[PDB]
Design an enzyme around this catalytic site. Sequence first.
Site, PDB file in Angstrom:
ATOM      1  N   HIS A 115      12.360 -26.388  23.779  1.00 64.42           N
ATOM      2  CA  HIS A 115      11.122 -26.862  23.181  1.00 64.42           C
ATOM      3  C   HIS A 115      11.176 -28.354  22.913  1.00 64.42           C
ATOM      4  O   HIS A 115      12.063 -28.860  22.219  1.00 64.42           O
ATOM      5  CB  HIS A 115      10.778 -26.086  21.903  1.00 64.42           C
ATOM      6  CG  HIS A 115      11.899 -26.010  20.914  1.00 64.42           C
ATOM      7  ND1 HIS A 115      13.052 -25.291  21.147  1.00 64.42           N
ATOM      8  CD2 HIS A 115      12.037 -26.553  19.681  1.00 64.42           C
ATOM      9  CE1 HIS A 115      13.860 -25.407  20.106  1.00 64.42           C
ATOM     10  NE2 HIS A 115      13.266 -26.169  19.203  1.00 64.42           N
ATOM     11  N   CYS A 168      14.644 -44.704   4.996  1.00 66.66           N
ATOM     12  CA  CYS A 168      13.269 -44.616   5.471  1.00 66.66           C
ATOM     13  C   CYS A 168      13.201 -45.112   6.912  1.00 66.66           C
ATOM     14  O   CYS A 168      13.733 -46.175   7.233  1.00 66.66           O
ATOM     15  CB  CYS A 168      12.364 -45.457   4.595  1.00 66.66           C
ATOM     16  SG  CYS A 168      10.661 -45.616   5.199  1.00 66.66           S
ATOM     17  N   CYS A 171      10.731 -48.688   6.931  1.00 69.71           N
ATOM     18  CA  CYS A 171      11.039 -49.963   6.274  1.00 69.71           C
ATOM     19  C   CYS A 171      12.526 -50.151   5.998  1.00 69.71           C
ATOM     20  O   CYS A 171      12.941 -51.225   5.569  1.00 69.71           O
ATOM     21  CB  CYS A 171      10.270 -50.092   4.960  1.00 69.71           C
ATOM     22  SG  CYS A 171      11.121 -49.282   3.593  1.00 69.71           S
ATOM     23  N   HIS A 185       8.462 -41.529  -1.231  1.00 69.53           N
ATOM     24  CA  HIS A 185       8.334 -42.785  -0.532  1.00 69.53           C
ATOM     25  C   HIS A 185       7.680 -42.612   0.843  1.00 69.53           C
ATOM     26  O   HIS A 185       6.943 -43.484   1.278  1.00 69.53           O
ATOM     27  CB  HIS A 185       9.705 -43.422  -0.388  1.00 69.53           C
ATOM     28  CG  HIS A 185       9.696 -44.705   0.377  1.00 69.53           C
ATOM     29  ND1 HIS A 185       9.377 -45.914  -0.203  1.00 69.53           N
ATOM     30  CD2 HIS A 185       9.975 -44.971   1.674  1.00 69.53           C
ATOM     31  CE1 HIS A 185       9.462 -46.871   0.704  1.00 69.53           C
ATOM     32  NE2 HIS A 185       9.819 -46.323   1.852  1.00 69.53           N
ATOM     33  N   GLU A 189       4.493 -44.553   2.320  1.00 69.06           N
ATOM     34  CA  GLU A 189       4.543 -45.239   3.606  1.00 69.06           C
ATOM     35  C   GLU A 189       3.407 -44.779   4.495  1.00 69.06           C
ATOM     36  O   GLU A 189       2.853 -45.569   5.255  1.00 69.06           O
ATOM     37  CB  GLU A 189       5.871 -44.981   4.322  1.00 69.06           C
ATOM     38  CG  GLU A 189       7.037 -45.810   3.801  1.00 69.06           C
ATOM     39  CD  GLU A 189       7.000 -47.247   4.283  1.00 69.06           C
ATOM     40  OE1 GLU A 189       5.911 -47.754   4.626  1.00 69.06           O
ATOM     41  OE2 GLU A 189       8.075 -47.871   4.334  1.00 69.06           O
TER      42      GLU A 189
HETATM   43 ZN   LIG Z   1       9.925 -47.258   3.743  1.00 67.72          ZN
END
Ligand SMILES: [Zn+2]
EC number: 3.6.1.71
Lengths: 200, 200
Positions: A115, A168, A171, A185, A189
Site C-alpha cells: 500500500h 516538527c 519548522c 504544535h 502549524e
Molecule cells: Zn513547527
Amino acid sequence: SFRDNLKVYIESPESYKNVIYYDDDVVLVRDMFPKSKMHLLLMTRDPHLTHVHPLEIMMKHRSLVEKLVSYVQGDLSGLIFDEARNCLSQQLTNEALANYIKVGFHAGPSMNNLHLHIMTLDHVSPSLKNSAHYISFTSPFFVKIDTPTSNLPTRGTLTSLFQEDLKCWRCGETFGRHFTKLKAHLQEEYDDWLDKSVSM
Amino acid sequence: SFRDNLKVYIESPESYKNVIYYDDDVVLVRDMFPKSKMHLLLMTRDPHLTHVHPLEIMMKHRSLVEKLVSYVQGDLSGLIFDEARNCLSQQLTNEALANYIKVGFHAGPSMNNLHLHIMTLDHVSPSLKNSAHYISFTSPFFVKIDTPTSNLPTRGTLTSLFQEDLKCWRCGETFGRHFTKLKAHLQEEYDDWLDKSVSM
DNA sequence: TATTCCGATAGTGA
DNA sequence: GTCACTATCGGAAT
Ligand SMILES: [Zn+2]
Ligand SMILES: [Zn+2]
C-alpha cells in the site's frame, strides 16, 4: 491475522464505500486511521505484487512504480485534489495542495498487502496518537516514491529511528519525547500554513 | 514544604482526632495513607530529635530507641491491639496480632519529622498503589526497630532496591514488576492468614 | 513501525 | 522512597 486486514479492499473493492477508485489493476482507499487530514492508500490488486516488500518493489519493480505514479499524477489526480479540498479547505488550489502532499511506502509496513501512502503533510488527526505514528511518516522510514534506488534504506535497519526525539517537520522545533506538545504544535502549524496558503 | 507535613501532629496533637495518643514526649497518629490495614506513626515531640535522621537515631540515640520500644510494648500496647482488631478482625488475639505487626523506620524517609512505623504485615490497602510503596516496607529499606546497630544499612545506599522484581513477603512468590498482580495476591494471602488465625 | 486495553514508568508541582 | 496529575512507555491479544 490483523496483518491481512487490507486484503479485503483489493479482493472486494465493490463492497466498500471508502474505496474511492478501483479498476482491474489498483484500488485507492481511505486509510481507516488517517495520520493526516487526508490519508489515502493506493494498492496493487496483482496477487503476486501485493505480497512483495515495498523496498523490493522500489528496487526491482520499476514498471509498477511508474504505473502507480502515473495513476497519482493522471487519472486519480482530480479525485485526490477533491479529497484534499474536502479534508482541508475548498479554498486551496491544486498548486498549493500538490506542495502539501507526500507519496511513499513504509520501509517496514505491518500490513502485508502493498500500500502506497498518499497524504497531506499536516499530521493533524485524531488517529495520530503516538510518536511511532509520527516518526513513521516523517523520517527515512517513509520511503517517498521518487527516492532514487541507490538511496533506498536497507530492509530491517530503521528500528532505532523510533526512539529519537521528536522534531516538527515544518519548522524544525524539537519536543524530546513530548508527543502531546508536538501534537498541539502541529495544529498551530496547520492553522499557520492554511492562513498563508489561502491568502495567496 | 510537603516534607514538613507531619509536624502538625507533634506541634498540635490536640487538634487531630487521628492522634490516638499524645503526651509531652511522643504522639501516636494514624498514617493518612495506610500501606497496610493498620498503619500508625509514633513520633517524638523533641524539637531536636524530630529532625535527626532515623539511621542516626538507631546508631547513636539508644535511649530514644528504648523509650519508643517501651511505649509500643507497654502503655500503648493495648491501644495498638485495639486498632489492629478494628482494622483486621475482632477475632484476633493479642498473640496472633503481635506476630503480624512490624515496627521500624524508613532508611530514607521523605517526611522530615522522625516517625516510627507500626503496621500490620498484610499490605492490603487502597493506599498501597505502587511498587516503591511495597518495597519500602518489605526490604532492608524498612529498618526494624530491633535491628542491631552493626547491621544497619548506610544512609543513601538503598536506591537500587526500588528497581528489583516484586516478591510476596509471606510465601516468596515472584511477580516481576507486575504490581497489580502482587496486589491481588496480597489480598489472597491476607484472607488465608485470617482464616488460619481465627481457626485457632 | 496495524489498533486497543491495561498497566508500569517517569516528571512535575505542591 | 510524600501525593496526585499527566503523559509516556511496554506487553498482549486481536
Ligand atoms: Zn513547527
Ligand atoms: Zn504469597
